[PDB]
Amino acid sequence: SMNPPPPETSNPNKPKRQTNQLQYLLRVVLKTLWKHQFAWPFQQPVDAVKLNLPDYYKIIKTPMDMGTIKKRLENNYYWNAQECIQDFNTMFTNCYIYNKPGDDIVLMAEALEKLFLQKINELPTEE
């Protein structure tokens, strides 16, 4: 059994910025989700070997997780907030695509996603 390489978190030739919106995504959005009781399955890439999910990376072709997003934010990987918001949405969508309604992991994702939506509703206007 084999995991793919993780998503990219470093690329010196990708242009990047540290906008007030990106700072909010780290300080408010990531921090809020990371500390939640249901964060743990989302704090690193899905390990299809350890979890015995040999079909996971056949079904999910754009993997994403908050460990990756945390590294991207800490490393100032992004150009804009939309890039980062897309990563959170990819993470949630992947979970809904792979799993069944009512599974524990789906309930966990839905709780995180409610908080995510509440926090990005107050994304600040760009400085």
Ligand X SMILES: Cc1noc(C)c1-c1cc(O)cc([C@H](O)C2CC2)c1
Residue 126 CA: distances (Å) to CA of 20, 23, 30, 83, 89:
6, 11, 18, 15, 21
60-89: which residues touch ligand X (CB under 6 A)? none
Of 3-11, 25-33, 45-53, 76-84: span binding ligand X (CB under 6 A): 45-53
For residues 19 and 41, which CB has a smaller minimum distance to ligand X in the complex? 41
Choice between 81 and 108, CB closer to ligand X:
108
Which amino acid would we find at residue 47?
Answer: D
Torsion-angle region of residue 102: left (phi > 0), alpha (psi -120 to 50) or beta?
left
Contact with ligand X (CB under 6 A) among 25, 81, 95, 112: 95
Handedness of CA 120, 85, 81, 11 (dihedral sign): positive
Smallest distance from ligand X to CB 86, Å: 17
Query: Should residue 105 be labelled a site residue for ligand X when binding is judged by CB under 6 A?
Result: yes
**Residues 71, 45: Cα–Cα separation, whole Å:** 12
Q: How far is the CB of 68 from ligand X (least distance, A)?
A: 12
Using the structure block, give the residue that is written with the tokens 């921090």. Answer: 31
Site string for ligand X, 20-39 (x = CB under 6 A): --------------------
Lookup: tokens for 82: 């939309």
Q: Which residues bind ligand X (CB under 6 A)?
A: 41-42, 46, 51, 53, 95, 98-99, 104-105, 108
